[PDB]
Coordinates of C-alpha atoms in Angstrom, one line a residue:
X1 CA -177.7 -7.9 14.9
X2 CA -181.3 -6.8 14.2
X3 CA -181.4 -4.7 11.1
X4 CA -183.2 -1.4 11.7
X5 CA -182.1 0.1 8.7
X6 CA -180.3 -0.4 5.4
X7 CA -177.8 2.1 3.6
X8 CA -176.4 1.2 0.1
X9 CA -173.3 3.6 -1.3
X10 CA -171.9 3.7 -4.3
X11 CA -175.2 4.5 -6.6
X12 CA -175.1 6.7 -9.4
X13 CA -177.9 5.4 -12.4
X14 CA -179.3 2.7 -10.1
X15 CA -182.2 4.0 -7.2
X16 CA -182.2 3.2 -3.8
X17 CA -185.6 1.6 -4.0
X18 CA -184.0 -0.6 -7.0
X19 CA -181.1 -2.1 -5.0
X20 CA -183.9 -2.3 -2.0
X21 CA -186.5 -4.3 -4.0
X22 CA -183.6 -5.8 -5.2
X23 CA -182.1 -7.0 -1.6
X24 CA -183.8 -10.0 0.1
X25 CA -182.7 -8.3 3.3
X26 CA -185.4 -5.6 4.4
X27 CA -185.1 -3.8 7.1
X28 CA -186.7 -5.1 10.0
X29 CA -184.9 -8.9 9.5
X30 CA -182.3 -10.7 11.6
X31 CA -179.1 -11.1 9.7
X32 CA -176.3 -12.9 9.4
X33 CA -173.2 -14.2 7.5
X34 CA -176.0 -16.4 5.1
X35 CA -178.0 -13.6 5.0
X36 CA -175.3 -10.9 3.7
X37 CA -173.4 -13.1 1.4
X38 CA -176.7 -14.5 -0.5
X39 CA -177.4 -10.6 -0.8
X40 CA -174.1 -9.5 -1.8
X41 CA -174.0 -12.7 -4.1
X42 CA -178.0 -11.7 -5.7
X43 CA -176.8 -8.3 -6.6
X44 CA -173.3 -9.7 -7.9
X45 CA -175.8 -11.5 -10.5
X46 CA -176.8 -8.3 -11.2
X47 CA -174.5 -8.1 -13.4
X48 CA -174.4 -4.3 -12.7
X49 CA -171.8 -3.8 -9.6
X50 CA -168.0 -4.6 -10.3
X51 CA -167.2 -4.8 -6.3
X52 CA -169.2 -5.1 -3.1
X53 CA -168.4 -5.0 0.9
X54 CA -170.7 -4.9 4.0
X55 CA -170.8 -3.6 7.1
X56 CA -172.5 -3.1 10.5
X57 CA -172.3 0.1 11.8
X58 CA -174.6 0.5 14.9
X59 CA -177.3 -1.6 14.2
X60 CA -177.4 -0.3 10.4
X61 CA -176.2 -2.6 7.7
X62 CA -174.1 -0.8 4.9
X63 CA -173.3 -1.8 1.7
X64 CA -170.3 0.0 -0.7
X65 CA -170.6 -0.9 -3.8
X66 CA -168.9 0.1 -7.3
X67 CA -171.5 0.4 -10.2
X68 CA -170.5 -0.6 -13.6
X69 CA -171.0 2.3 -16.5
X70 CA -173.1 2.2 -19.3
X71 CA -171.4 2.5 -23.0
X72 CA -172.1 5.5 -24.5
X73 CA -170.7 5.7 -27.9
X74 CA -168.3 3.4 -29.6
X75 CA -165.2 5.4 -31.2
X76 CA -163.2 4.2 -34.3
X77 CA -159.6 5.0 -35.1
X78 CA -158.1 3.0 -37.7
X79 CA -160.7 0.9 -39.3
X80 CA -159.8 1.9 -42.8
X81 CA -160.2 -2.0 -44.0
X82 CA -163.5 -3.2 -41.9
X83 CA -166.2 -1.1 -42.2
X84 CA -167.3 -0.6 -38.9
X85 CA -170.9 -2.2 -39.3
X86 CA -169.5 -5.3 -39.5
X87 CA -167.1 -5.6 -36.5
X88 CA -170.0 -4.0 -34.6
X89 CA -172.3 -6.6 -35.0
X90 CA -169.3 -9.0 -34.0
X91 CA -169.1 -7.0 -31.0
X92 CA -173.0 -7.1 -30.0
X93 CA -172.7 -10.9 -29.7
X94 CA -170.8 -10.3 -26.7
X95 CA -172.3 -7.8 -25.5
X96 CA -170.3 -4.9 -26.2
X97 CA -172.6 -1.9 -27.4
X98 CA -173.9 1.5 -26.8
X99 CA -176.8 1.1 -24.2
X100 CA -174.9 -2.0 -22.2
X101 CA -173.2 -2.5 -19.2
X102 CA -169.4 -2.3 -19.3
X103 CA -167.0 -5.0 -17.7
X104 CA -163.4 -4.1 -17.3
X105 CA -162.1 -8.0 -16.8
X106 CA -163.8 -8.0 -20.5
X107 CA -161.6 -5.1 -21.7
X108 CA -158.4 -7.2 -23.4
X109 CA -160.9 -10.1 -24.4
X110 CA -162.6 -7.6 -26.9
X111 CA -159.4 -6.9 -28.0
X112 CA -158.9 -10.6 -28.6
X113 CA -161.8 -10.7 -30.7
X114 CA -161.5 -8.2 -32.5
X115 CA -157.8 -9.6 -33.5
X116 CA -159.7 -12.9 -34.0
X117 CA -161.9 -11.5 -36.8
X118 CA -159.0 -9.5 -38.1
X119 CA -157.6 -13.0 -39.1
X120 CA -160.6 -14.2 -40.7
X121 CA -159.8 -11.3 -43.0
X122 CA -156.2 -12.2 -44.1
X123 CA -154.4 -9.9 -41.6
X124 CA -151.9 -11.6 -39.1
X125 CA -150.2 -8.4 -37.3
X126 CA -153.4 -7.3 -35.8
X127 CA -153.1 -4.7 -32.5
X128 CA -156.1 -3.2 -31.3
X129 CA -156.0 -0.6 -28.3
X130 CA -158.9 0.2 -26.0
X131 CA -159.3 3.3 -23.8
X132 CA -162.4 3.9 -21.5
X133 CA -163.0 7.7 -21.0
X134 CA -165.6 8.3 -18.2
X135 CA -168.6 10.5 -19.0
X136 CA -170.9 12.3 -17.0
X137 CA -174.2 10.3 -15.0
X138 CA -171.9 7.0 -14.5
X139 CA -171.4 6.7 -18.3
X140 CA -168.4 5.3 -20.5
X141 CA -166.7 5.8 -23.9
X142 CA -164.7 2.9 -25.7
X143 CA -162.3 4.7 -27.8
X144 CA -160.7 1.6 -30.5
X145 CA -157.4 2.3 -32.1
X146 CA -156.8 -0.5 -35.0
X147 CA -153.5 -1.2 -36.5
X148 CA -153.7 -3.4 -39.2
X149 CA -149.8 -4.5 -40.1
X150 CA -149.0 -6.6 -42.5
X151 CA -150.8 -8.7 -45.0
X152 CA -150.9 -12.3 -43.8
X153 CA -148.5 -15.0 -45.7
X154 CA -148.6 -18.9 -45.2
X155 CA -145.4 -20.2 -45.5
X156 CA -144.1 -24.0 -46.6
X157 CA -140.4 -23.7 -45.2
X158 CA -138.7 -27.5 -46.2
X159 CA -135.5 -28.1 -45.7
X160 CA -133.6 -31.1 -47.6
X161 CA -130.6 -32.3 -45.1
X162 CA -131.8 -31.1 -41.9
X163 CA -130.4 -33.7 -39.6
X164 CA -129.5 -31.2 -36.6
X165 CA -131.7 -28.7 -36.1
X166 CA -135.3 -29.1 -35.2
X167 CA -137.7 -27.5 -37.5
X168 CA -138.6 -24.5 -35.8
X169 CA -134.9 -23.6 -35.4
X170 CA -135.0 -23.0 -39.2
X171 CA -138.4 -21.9 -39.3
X172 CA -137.2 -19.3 -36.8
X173 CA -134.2 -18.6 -39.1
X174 CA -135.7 -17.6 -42.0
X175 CA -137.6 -14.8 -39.9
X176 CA -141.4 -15.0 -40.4
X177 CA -142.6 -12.5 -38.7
X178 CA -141.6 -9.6 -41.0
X179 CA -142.6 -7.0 -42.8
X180 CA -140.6 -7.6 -46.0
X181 CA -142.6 -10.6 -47.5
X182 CA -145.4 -9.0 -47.6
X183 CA -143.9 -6.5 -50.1
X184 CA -143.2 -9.5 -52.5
X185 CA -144.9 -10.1 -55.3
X186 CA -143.2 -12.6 -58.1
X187 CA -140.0 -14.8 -56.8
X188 CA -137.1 -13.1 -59.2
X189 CA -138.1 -9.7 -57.4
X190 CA -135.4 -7.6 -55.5
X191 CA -137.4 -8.4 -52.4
X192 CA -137.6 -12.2 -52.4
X193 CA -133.5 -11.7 -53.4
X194 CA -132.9 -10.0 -50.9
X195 CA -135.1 -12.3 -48.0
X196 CA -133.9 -15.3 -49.5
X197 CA -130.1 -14.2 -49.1
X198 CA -130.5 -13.0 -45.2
X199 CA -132.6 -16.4 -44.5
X200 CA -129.8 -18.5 -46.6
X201 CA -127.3 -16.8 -44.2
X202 CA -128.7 -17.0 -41.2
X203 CA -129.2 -21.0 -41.7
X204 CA -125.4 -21.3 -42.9
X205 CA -124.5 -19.2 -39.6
X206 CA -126.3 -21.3 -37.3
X207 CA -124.6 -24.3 -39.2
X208 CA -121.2 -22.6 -39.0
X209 CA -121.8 -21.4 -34.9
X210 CA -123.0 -25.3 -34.3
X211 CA -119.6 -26.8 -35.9
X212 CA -120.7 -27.5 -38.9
X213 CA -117.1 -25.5 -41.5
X214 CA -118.0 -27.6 -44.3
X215 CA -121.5 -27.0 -44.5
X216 CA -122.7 -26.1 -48.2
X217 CA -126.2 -25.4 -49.7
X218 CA -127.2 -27.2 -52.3
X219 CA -130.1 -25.4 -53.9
X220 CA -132.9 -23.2 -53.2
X221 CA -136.6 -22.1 -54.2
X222 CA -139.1 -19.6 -53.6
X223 CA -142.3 -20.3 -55.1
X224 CA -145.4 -17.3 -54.8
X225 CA -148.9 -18.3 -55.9
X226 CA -150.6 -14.9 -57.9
X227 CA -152.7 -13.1 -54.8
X228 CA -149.6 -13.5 -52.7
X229 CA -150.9 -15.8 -49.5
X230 CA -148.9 -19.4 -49.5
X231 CA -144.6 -19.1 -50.1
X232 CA -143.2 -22.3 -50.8
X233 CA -140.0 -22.4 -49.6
X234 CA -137.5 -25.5 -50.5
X235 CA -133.4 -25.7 -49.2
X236 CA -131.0 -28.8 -49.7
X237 CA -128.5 -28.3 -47.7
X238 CA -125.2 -30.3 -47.3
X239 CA -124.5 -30.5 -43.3
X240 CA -121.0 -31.9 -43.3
X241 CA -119.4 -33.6 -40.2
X242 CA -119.1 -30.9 -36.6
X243 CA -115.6 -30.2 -36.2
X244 CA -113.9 -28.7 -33.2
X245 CA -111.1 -26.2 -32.2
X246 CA -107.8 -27.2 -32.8
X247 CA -104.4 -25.1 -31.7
X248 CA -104.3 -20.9 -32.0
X249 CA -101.8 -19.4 -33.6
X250 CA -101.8 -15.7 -33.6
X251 CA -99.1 -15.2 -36.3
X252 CA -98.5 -12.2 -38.2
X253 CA -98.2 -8.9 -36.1
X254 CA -100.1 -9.6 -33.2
X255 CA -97.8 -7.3 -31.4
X256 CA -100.1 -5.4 -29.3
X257 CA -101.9 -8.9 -27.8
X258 CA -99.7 -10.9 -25.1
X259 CA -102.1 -14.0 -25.2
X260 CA -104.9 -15.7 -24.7
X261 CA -107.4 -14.5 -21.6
X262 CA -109.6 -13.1 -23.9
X263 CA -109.2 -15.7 -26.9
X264 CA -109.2 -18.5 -24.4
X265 CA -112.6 -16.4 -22.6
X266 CA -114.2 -16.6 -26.1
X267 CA -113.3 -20.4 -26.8
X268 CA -110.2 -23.0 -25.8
X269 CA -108.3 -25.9 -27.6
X270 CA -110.9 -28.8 -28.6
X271 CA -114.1 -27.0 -28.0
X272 CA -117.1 -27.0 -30.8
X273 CA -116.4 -24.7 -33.3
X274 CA -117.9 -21.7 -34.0
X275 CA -117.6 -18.4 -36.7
X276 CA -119.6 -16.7 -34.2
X277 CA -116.2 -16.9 -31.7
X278 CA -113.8 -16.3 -34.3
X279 CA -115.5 -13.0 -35.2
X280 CA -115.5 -11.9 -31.6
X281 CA -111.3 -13.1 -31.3
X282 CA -111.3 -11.0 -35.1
X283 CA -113.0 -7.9 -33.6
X284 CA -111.4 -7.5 -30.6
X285 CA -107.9 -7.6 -32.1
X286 CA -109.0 -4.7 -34.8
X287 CA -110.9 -2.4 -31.4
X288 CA -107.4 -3.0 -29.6
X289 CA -105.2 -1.7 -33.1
X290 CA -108.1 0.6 -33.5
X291 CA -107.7 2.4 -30.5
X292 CA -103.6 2.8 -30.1
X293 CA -103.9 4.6 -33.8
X294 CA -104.1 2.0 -37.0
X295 CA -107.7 2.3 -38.6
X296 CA -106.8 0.2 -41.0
X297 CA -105.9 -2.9 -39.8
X298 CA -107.1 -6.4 -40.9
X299 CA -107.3 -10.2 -39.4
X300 CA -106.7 -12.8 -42.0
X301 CA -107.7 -16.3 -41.3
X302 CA -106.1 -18.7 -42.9
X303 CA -107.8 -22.7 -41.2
X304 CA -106.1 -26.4 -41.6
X305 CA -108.8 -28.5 -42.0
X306 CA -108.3 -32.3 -41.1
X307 CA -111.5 -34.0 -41.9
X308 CA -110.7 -37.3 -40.7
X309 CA -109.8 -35.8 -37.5
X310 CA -112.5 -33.6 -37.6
X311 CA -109.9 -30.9 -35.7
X312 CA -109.6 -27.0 -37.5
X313 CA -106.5 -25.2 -36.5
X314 CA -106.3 -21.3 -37.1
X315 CA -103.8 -19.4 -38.3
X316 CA -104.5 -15.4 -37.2
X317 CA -102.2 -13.4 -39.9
X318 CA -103.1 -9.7 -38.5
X319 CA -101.6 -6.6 -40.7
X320 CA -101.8 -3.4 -38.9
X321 CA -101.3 -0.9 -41.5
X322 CA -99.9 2.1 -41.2
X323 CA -100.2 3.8 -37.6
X324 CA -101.4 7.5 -37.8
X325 CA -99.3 9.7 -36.5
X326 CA -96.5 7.3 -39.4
X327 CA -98.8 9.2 -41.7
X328 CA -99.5 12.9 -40.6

C-alpha cells in the first residue's frame, strides 16, 4: 500500500489542509497499521472528532470522521435562584462555554455539576436537563432546564430501644426524602403533627409486621433550629418480646368463607406475626361480603395474648349487616 492520495470525510468547520497539516501521513508515504493508528490516535488528541475509521480504497487512504460542534449560546430555563453568572463561570472550568468544543460523553457530567453546586446552595432535590439542538455550520445549542425542589433539611433521627432494626430501616421509615418537611417551620405546627404521626406509624407497623403486638412508644421529639436546616428527631420506643401465630378462629358469621386456603395462603399456625397479614385475612372477608350484597359489613378482632408463651390466638367475629336487597 503506497499512498498516492489522501481523502478525509466528515469536515464541516475544519479545512482539508488543516486535517492534512495535521496528519503525519502525506501522501506519497508507505503505510501501515502503525502508520494509520498513530494518525487516527494524533487527530483523536485533537480533541475535535468524536469518531474515526480508515480505509483503503484503491490505493487511496480514506478517513470518516465525525466532527464535534462548537457551542453557540448557552440557554437558561429555570434558574430563578442562581443567577446565571455564577453557574457559568462554574461551567467554564470545565470547559463548557460558547466558543468551545462540545463532548457528548460530557453531557450528564455537566448535569452532575451543576447538581453538585446546587448543594453548596442548600438545595438537595436538584434535576437539571440538557438538550443539544443542532445549528447551522456544525454548530450547537445547550438548552438547561433547572428544577430546584425542595429546600435541603439535615436530619438527627435517634431512636431509644432500637434492638431490631438497623438504622436505616427507621431512617427509611420516617420518609426523608419528602416534600412536607420543608414546609415546617416551628415543631407544634400542623405539618410537623402531621409528619411526626405518619413516621410514628410507620415505625409501630414495621414493629407490628416483624412480631413485635406489644410494642409501645414511649416518647417523642421534634426539635427545628430558626432558619429551618437541622431536625432533631428523638423516639423511645418499647420493643416487647416477637410473638407468633397461634390457632384461627373464624367465629361470628363467617358464613360465606369455607376455610382456610386463602387465610392459610396469607399466614399458618406458629408463623411470625404480622398486622400486615391480618389486614389482608380482614379485607378479603369484607371484598367477598362486599360483593354478594352487604356494604356494611365489619371484621372484629378480638386476640389472646399469652406472653410467656409468646403465642397470639385470633378470634375473627365478622357482622355482615344487613344484605341489600333485606333493605330495598
Amino acid at each position: 500500500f503506497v499512498v498516492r492520495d489522501i481523502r478525509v470525510n466528515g469536515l464541516v468547520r475544519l479545512t482539508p489542509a488543516n486535517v492534512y497539516t495535521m496528519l503525519p501521513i502525506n501522501s506519497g508515504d508507505r503505510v501501515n497499521e502503525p502508520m494509520i493508528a498513530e494518525a487516527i490516535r494524533t487527530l483523536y488528541a485533537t480533541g475535535l472528532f468524536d469518531d474515526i475509521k480508515a480505509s483503503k480504497e484503491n490505493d487511496t487512504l480514506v478517513f470518516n470522521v465525525i466532527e464535534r460542534p462548537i457551542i453557540s449560546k448557552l440557554e437558561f430555563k429555570g434558574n430563578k435562584l442562581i443567577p446565571k453568572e455564577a453557574l457559568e463561570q462554574g461551567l467554564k472550568k470545565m470547559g463548557i462555554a460558547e466558543g468551545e468544543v462540545f463532548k457528548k460523553s460530557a453531557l450528564q457530567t455537566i448535569e452532575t455539576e451543576l447538581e453538585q453546586q446546587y448543594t453548596q446552595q442548600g438545595r438537595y432535590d436538584a434535576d437539571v436537563t440538557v438538550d443539544t439542538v443542532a445549528r447551522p455550520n456544525n454548530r450547537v445549542e445547550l438548552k438547561i432546564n433547572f428544577n430546584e425542589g425542595t429546600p435541603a433539611k439535615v436530619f438527627d433521627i435517634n431512636v431509644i430501644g432500637n434492638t431490631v432494626f438497623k438504622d436505616s430501616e427507621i431512617k427509611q421509615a420516617f420518609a426523608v426524602k419528602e416534600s412536607g418537611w420543608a414546609s415546617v417551620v416551628t415543631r407544634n405546627d400542623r405539618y410537623a403533627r402531621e409528619k411526626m404521626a405518619a413516621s410514628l406509624e410507620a415505625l409501630r407497623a414495621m414493629y407490628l409486621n416483624k412480631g413485635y403486638i406489644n410494642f409501645n412508644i414511649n416518647n417523642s421529639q421534634l426539635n427545628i433550629s430558626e432558619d429551618k436546616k437541622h431536625i432533631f428527631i428523638e423516639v423511645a420506643v418499647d420493643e416487647g418480646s416477637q410473638f407468633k401465630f397461634g390457632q384461627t378462629k373464624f367465629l361470628g358469621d363467617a358464613l360465606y368463607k369455607p376455610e382456610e386456603l386463602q387465610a392459610l395462603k396469607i399466614y399458618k399456625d406458629g408463623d411470625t406475626y404480622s398486622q400486615e397479614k391480618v389486614n389482608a385475612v380482614k379485607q378479603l372477608l369484607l371484598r367477598k361480603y362486599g360483593n354478594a350484597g352487604y356494604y356494611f359489613a365489619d371484621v372484629n378482632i378480638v386476640p389472646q395474648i399469652n406472653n410467656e408463651t409468646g403465642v397470639v390466638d385470633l378470634n375473627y367475629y365478622v357482622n355482615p349487616g344487613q344484605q341489600v336487597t333485606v333493605r330495598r
